[PDB]
């Protein structure tokens with residue numbers, strides 16, 4: 001899987017070290033990057049930059065699978081529960097494993113509360129044979145109170161050391177620091193193979209919208225979101241991890257980011273408020289599920305019924 | 306912390322004094338600042354703008370902390386009491402130290418009275434080992450009667466010189482003067498390290514709403530509030546100070562500013578009137594605390610029971 | 611104070627006379643005015659609009675005063691008596707000098723009678739070293755009977771020429787004529803420096819309600835009250851004059867204007883009727899004084915005991 005099986009095909013050891021310096025840590029990463037981007041590194045000319053693909057084509061089929069064989073391949077996709085059974089019923093088992101899930105709401109609809117339950121409920125063996133692993137959290141506003149996890153660790157009856165130890169945390173201060181933080185996401189996913197299960201960005205555009213205030217330069221923000229919306233989709237397919245992002249709204253309402261975020265998101269969940277601690281969850285833009293509604297109440301312990 | 310430790314890591318003295326000219330005085334202040342805001346200072350170009358960042362990369366980890374190590378880091382967050390124990394119980398210890406707290410009410414619900422007690426009660430050693438320091442006050446309507454402090458200095462039994470000397474005052478006349486006044490906030494926070502504890506803006510939108518009309522030019526204000534709502538969040542994290550702002554209402558009521566202020570605020574407290582001098586305080590949009598209520602009295606001495 | 615002191619700091623005579631053409635006649639008047647309101651005068655563009663502000667920056671500190679130094683600065687605030695000692699005791703010395711005071715009542719509670727005493731009692735040297743000066747009156751219904759002053763001039767034992775000569779009068783016919791009348795208020799305040807002490811608008815909303823209907827176009831008024839409620843607060847701070855407005859009521863009662871007037875008013879006095887010629891005065895929304903009551907009488911001579 002890693003860049004070590006290419007040595008027994010023709011590729012020398014002087015190119016392997018330079019290949020891992022750019023970011024490529026997997027064999028699927030060589031087939032996910034174009035030749036133009038591979039020729040932007042000093043030490044590998046076109047002649048030698050095309051020879052690595054020849055050895056990368058004899059490892060995996062560049063062919064056409066039958067759709068019956070593809071359903072056998074799509075049984076490694078897991079599903080992470082939310083904490084409430086009516087809401088998992090809405091998403092069709094929970095949060096998908098090779099996709100990007102978005103949630104947007106007004107201001108108190110429970111977007112940080114949904115992300116705090118997933119830091120606990122994804123370390124627990126649930127349905128479909130899902131074993132449970134560690135969790136990366138990237139927070140952009142400030143809202144990662146770790147004492148809130150010790151409320152949700154009690155209703156699942158797990159100890160507080162093993163639930164505060166499998167969560168890794170890093171705050172991005174700006175959108176460039178949000179960009180450079182995904183290098184350490186891949187470097188942590190690769191050296192610990194298969195014991196990371198999801199990745200949370202607390203908000204993708206708390207830092208994007210603020211930097212580019214001007215209307216005139218707005219277009220570039222759409223070639224810089226498009227960097228990390230496909231960077232994020234490629235990370236979820238090499239390492240088979242879920243991706244959960246949350247979004248804010250603007251003013252009679254619609255989320256921020258427009259059509260690029262709405263296209264690149266596989267599943268969007270709208271969140272609005274009911275009486276007291278009840279909230280409503282509708283489905284926008286899902287490939288399988290229809291537009292239905294549910295009801296989750298924010299309790300001491302996060303999402304419930 | 307401050308910028309002399311870059312000098313031993315490859316940066317000459319020739320470019321430090323221009324980084325102190327825009328406003329950056331902290332190692333974290335370069336991590337808060339983009340590579341975009343670092344190019345429009347005249348005299349720093351592209352192959353030399355980068356080497357400050359990678360020499361800032363050796364002072365700090367750009368890594369991923371475990372959440373158990375983050376709880377060890379979040380013991381520098383203090384809590385400032387309000388003046389009444391039932392109301393501190395509602396907020397969970399008082400006013401948080403790395404966040405933005407908002408309070409809105411109708412017209413006599415006690416928003417200026419709550420801000421006048423915090424100019425006295427934050428100079429007093431309270432719970433959690435909070436030592437007590439000085440206070441910045443930015444007032445936008447007119448309501449900073451300093452003789453009201455000499456009513457609240459008596460119920461805590463402190464002398465009147467030491468309670469009128471640790472409060473700094475400046476009135477913003479317009480929203481641009483509100484913007485340029487935060488430069489002197491950082492320049493005062495930096496030369497007196499650690500002996501400033503909070504920052505009060507008496508109202509954020511007494512001046513924002515007036516200059517503009519209605520939907521004629523709605524956009525210019527939501528990218529100009531978004532400047533000083535993240536300017537204010539960044540100041541609270543470099544220097545570890547609390548931020549307390551108050552808000553007005555409009556007409557069956559909801560505050561002014563909409564979703565940008567409602568998103569950027571970590572904690573909102575609604576205030577409404579009871580019989581006589583009793584008021585009610587509900588919680589809107591908190592990351593830890595649930596929606597409860599409490600009663601406080603506006604006595605001679607500010608907030609009481 | 612006035613605009614000749616900018617001439618010695620780099621500004622030619624060519625651009626002073628156009629700043630005196632929009633209405634700005636004071637060094638503080640440039641600090642009250644944005645860089646936005648300074649561009650729509652034709653003949654002043656972007657690289658030259660800025661240098662007035664930074665040359666206004668050397669006349670004053672843009673800094674932070676200690677609150678002990680601010681109490682030394684707030685001894686130029688005077689207090690004008692009402693005519694009765696029990697009612698001055700309620701307001702804490704009388705009518706404040708850098709604020710907006712509102713009085714509302716049912717229909718015969720004595721709002722015009724209170725305004726007729728202040729045209730006499732403010733020309734008399736009272737408490738706190740208040741010397742006494744001239745008075746601007748803006749009337750909106752019709753009720754400025756000048757023979758009523760010659761009843762109140764007798765109980766203070768002053769002659770009738772010197773009490774009918776220091777009162778200037780102008781009736782606004784509509785709310786736009788109410789708006790354009792504040793230009794002559796500033797032009798009269800500036801050429802006679804320090805010998806004007808208050809400003810009375812007989813009712814702010816006798817004219818702001820006739821022009822607009824119901825809910826169909828409610829907004830065009832809020833954005834237009836908010837013009838002259840901050841226009842009026844800015845006039846009171848450049849020239850240090852009191853502002854007294856009166857308000858009407860509607861139907862179990864509350865005044866007209868809602869939350870914008872209730873926020874922008876520093877002190878509100880409710881007025882209701884007792885037996886015969888006794889009235890009651892309660893305090894709504896004061897920054898210093900508590901909610902108390904004080905009966906006053908409407909005699910031949912206005913307000914008494």
Ligand SMILES: Nc1ncnc2c1ncn2[C@@H]1O[C@H](COP(=O)(O)OP(=O)(O)NP(=O)(O)O)[C@@H](O)[C@H]1O
Pocket residue numbers: 105106107108109110111112113114143298299300301567568569570588589590591592593594595596
């Ligand atoms: N411990 C708790 N118990 C019960 N309710 C809580 C608790 N903590 C927070 N809440 C409620 O959860 C809501 C806040 O949820 P939250 O996920 O923070 O929304 P949010 O979308 O992140 N707000 P924002 O980031 O500004 O958009 C509020 O209604 C709180 O009252």
Ligand SMILES: Nc1ncnc2c1ncn2[C@@H]1O[C@H](COP(=O)(O)OP(=O)(O)NP(=O)(O)O)[C@@H](O)[C@H]1O
Pocket residue numbers: 410411412413414415416417418419446448603604605606872873874875876893894895896897898899900901
């Ligand atoms: N010294 C005092 N003792 C008792 N009550 C007081 C005192 N000073 C003010 N009050 C009361 O406090 C209330 C005013 O509180 P305040 O905090 O100024 O409200 P506010 O929201 O700032 N008004 P506004 O700025 O126009 O929206 C009124 O009911 C006053 O009667």
Ligand SMILES: Nc1ncnc2c1ncn2[C@@H]1O[C@H](COP(=O)(O)OP(=O)(O)NP(=O)(O)O)[C@@H](O)[C@H]1O
Pocket residue numbers: 715716717718719720721722723724751753908909910911
């Ligand atoms: N010379 C006087 N001597 C005694 N009482 C008087 C005299 N002139 C007027 N009054 C009384 O004072 C009151 C006048 O009320 P006024 O000052 O007009 O309040 P008002 O609220 O402005 N009325 P309105 O303008 O219709 O809302 C009435 O009760 C009169 O009877």
Ligand SMILES: [Ca+2]
Pocket residue numbers: 111112141143
């Ligand atoms: Ca949140």
Ligand SMILES: [Ca+2]
Pocket residue numbers: 416417446448
């Ligand atoms: Ca106030």
Ligand SMILES: [Ca+2]
Pocket residue numbers: 721722751753
């Ligand atoms: Ca009248």
